[PDB]
Amino acid sequence: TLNGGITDMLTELANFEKNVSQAIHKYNAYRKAASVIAKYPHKIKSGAEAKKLPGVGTKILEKIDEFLATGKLRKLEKIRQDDTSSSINFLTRVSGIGPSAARKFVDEGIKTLEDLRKNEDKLNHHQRIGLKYFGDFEKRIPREEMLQMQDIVLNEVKKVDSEYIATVCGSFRRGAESSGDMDVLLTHPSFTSESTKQPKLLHQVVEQLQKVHFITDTLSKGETKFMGVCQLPSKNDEKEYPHRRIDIRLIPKDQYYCGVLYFTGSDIFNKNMRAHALEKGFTINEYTIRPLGVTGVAGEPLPVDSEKDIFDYIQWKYREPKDRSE
DNA sequence: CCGACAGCGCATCAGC
DNA sequence: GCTGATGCGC
DNA sequence: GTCGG
Ligand SMILES: Cc1cn([C@H]2C[C@H](O)[C@@H](COP(=O)(O)OP(=O)(O)[C@H](Cl)P(=O)(O)O)O2)c(=O)[nH]c1=O
Ligand SMILES: [Cl-]
Ligand SMILES: [Cl-]
Ligand SMILES: [Mg+2]
Ligand code: NA
Ligand code: NA
């Protein structure tokens, strides 16, 4: 990409803040500046040029100047020399291994991919699966494969009940050419806001996708969220597709637009939009938008008939999913 | 000069 | 086993 | 680490 060196540097700094420092706001800060720079259709030539962009303040500006001048950041080279941090940075790339498990592993002398394989009895189920598919889960999903997965999922939910609705969200719905996982929003006029004629709806759908061997593994399961692993069928004589992460969310119908807003993101967009909602006197979660009182108590859920209605309350112009790629 | 920084679902662990 | 906190991931 | 107040 055009400013790929700068956004790589910021992402590496961000990974350090998340994985090692656990400095969440510094993580998001590096991450926000990385987002707006990758989006800027111009070759950044100095830190001052970048300091014109939102999210880029003094210290990211200075780090841009250092990186432009040298190809490097001393901070990053020092982190890369730190064995504990670097081991932690690697181990947190396994799905299910965060900073706590990472440094637990490192103190146990477990710090490599093959260390993990030798001590698999030390991993919980999520971590075992993350290790099993580690190479797979480093691979992104071409949009063309996302279309095939979408075809399978949307038809299968119709097979369980023809009035299920399934919307593939996340980066795919913002039009990305590749995606990290598959995010499937699901609902049914049976299910309205927690007035349940009887649940088990998500399990029914998961059952069916397991039955056709699309879902191959389970990471988490509740009444509203399933996390697991799935795989496209291969044709005879031919290399398997990589296994893929999948998240399916079952949401009440009267909450569909909040659900699809949230599940479409991006995460930075969601954080920004939700912050502006607080500034305007509302709170937005995946289910509802509510008013806030002076003392902060949330009101009752507001009517929503579209994504645009949510933008209207907080006095934003509607943004197509493709322009929410923050 | 400093405090805010989104909001949630599910799994597991520590202590009882 | 439960509560409540922590961990990890959308 | 940035931003807004
Ligand atoms: C991680 C995260 C996600 N979301 C919402 C917004 C997200 O859009 C939605 C999907 O989460 P995802 O992790 O799959 O994000 P994505 O956009 O699909 C990624 Cl670019 P990729 O999967 O293609 O690699 O969940 C949040 O609201 N807060 C969050 O902290
Ligand atoms: Cl570097
Ligand atoms: Cl709610
Ligand atoms: Mg996704
Ligand atoms: Na991970
Ligand atoms: Na996801």
CA A126 to centroid of ligand 5, rounded, Å: 10
> Which element (helix H / strand E) includes A215?
strand A215-221
Report residue A135 as tokens. 């190479």
Domain-ending residue, one of A82, A104, A125: A82
Say whether both A40 and A112 belong to one domain.
no
Q: What is the resolution of this structure in A?
A: 2.1
For residue A204, give the CATH number of its domain: 3.30.460.10
Say whether both A118 and A131 belong to one domain.
yes
Q: Is A63 a catalytic residue?
A: yes
For residue A97, give the CATH number of its domain: 1.10.150.20
Say whether both A64 and A152 belong to one domain.
no
- CA atom of A224 to C1′ atom of D3, Å: 36
Instruction: Please state the atom number of ligand 1 nearest to the C-alpha of residue A179.
Output: 23
Report the relative pairing of strands A165-168 and A182-187 from DSSP bridges.
antiparallel
Q: How far apart are CA A30 and CA A13, in angstroms?
A: 7
DSSP letter at A156 equals H
Say whether both A257 and A219 belong to one domain.
yes
Are A214 and A156 in contact by the 8 Å Cβ rule? The answer is yes
Residue A165 burial (CB < 10 Å; 0-12/13-18/19+)? middle
Parent domain of A105: 83-139
DSSP letter at A298 equals B
Say whether both A146 and A253 belong to one domain.
yes
For residue A56, give the CATH number of its domain: 1.10.150.110
**Which residues of A are known binding-site members for Na(+)?**
51, 53, 56, 92, 94, 97
Backbone φ and ψ for A136, nearest 5 degrees, come out as -50, -45
Say whether both A170 and A249 belong to one domain.
yes
Say whether both A199 and A236 belong to one domain.
yes
Q: Which amino acid is at A50?
A: A
Residues with Cβ within 8 Å of residue A202, at least 6 apart in sequence: A186, A221, A222, A223, A224, A225, A226, A248, A250
Structurally, chain A folds into a number of domains equal to: 4
Select from A255, A270, A53 the least CA-distant residue to A174: A270
C-alpha dist (Å) from residue A240 to A215, A230, A234, A245, A284: 14, 12, 5, 15, 41
Say whether both A77 and A92 belong to one domain.
no
Say whether both A304 and A276 belong to one domain.
yes
**Ligand of minimum distance to the alpha carbon of A76:** 2
Say whether both A218 and A308 belong to one domain.
no
Q: Using a CB cutoff of 8 Å and minimum separation of 24, what contacts does A139-143 make?
A: A139/A242, A140/A178, A140/A179, A140/A180, A141/A178, A141/A179, A141/A180, A141/A181, A141/A182, A141/A244, A142/A177, A142/A178, A143/A172, A143/A176, A143/A177, A143/A178, A143/A179
Residue ranges near ligand 6 (ion) with Cβ within 5 Å: A 181, 183, 247
Report which of residues 10-29 in chain A place their beta carbon less than 7 angstroms from any atom of strand D.
25-26, 28-29
Select from A167, A97, A155 the least CA-distant residue to A126: A97
* Side-chain-side CA neighbours of residue A173 (13 Å): 20
Residue A3 burial (CB < 10 Å; 0-12/13-18/19+)? buried
Are A220 and A198 in contact by the 8 Å Cβ rule? The answer is no
The one catalytic residue in A18, A26, A39, A63 is A63
Q: How far apart are CA A249 and CA A286, in angstroms?
A: 10
DSSP letter at A19 equals I
Q: How far apart are CA A268 and CA A69, in angstroms?
A: 29
A244 three-state secondary structure:
strand
> Cβ < 6 Å from ligand 1: which residues?
A 170-171, 179-181, 183, 262-267, 270
- The residue nearest atom 20 of ligand 1, judged by CA position, is A171
Q: How far apart are CA A194 and CA A192, in angstroms?
A: 6
Q: How far apart are CA A126 and CA A185, in angstroms?
A: 22
- The residue nearest atom 1 of ligand 1, judged by CA position, is A267
- The residue nearest atom 18 of ligand 1, judged by CA position, is A170
Say whether both A273 and A246 belong to one domain.
no
Q: What angle do CA A59, A268, A253 make, to 5 degrees?
A: 170
Query: Considering just the CA atoms, what is the radius of gyration of chain A in Å?
Result: 22
Report residue A314 as tokens. 């907080």
Q: How far apart are CA A156 and CA A153, in angstroms?
A: 5
- CA atom of A279 to C1′ atom of D5, Å: 13
- CA atom of A282 to C1′ atom of B13, Å: 35
Residue A70 burial (CB < 10 Å; 0-12/13-18/19+)? exposed
Domain-ending residue, one of A262, A290, A316: A262
Residue A277 burial (CB < 10 Å; 0-12/13-18/19+)? buried
- Nearest amino-acid residue to B10, taking CA and C1': A220
Q: How far apart are CA A36 and CA A22, in angstroms?
A: 23
Residue ranges near ligand 3 (ion) with Cβ within 5 Å: A 287-288
Domain-ending residue, one of A82, A107, A130: A82
Q: How far apart are CA A111 and CA A88, in angstroms?
A: 8
Say whether both A58 and A93 belong to one domain.
no
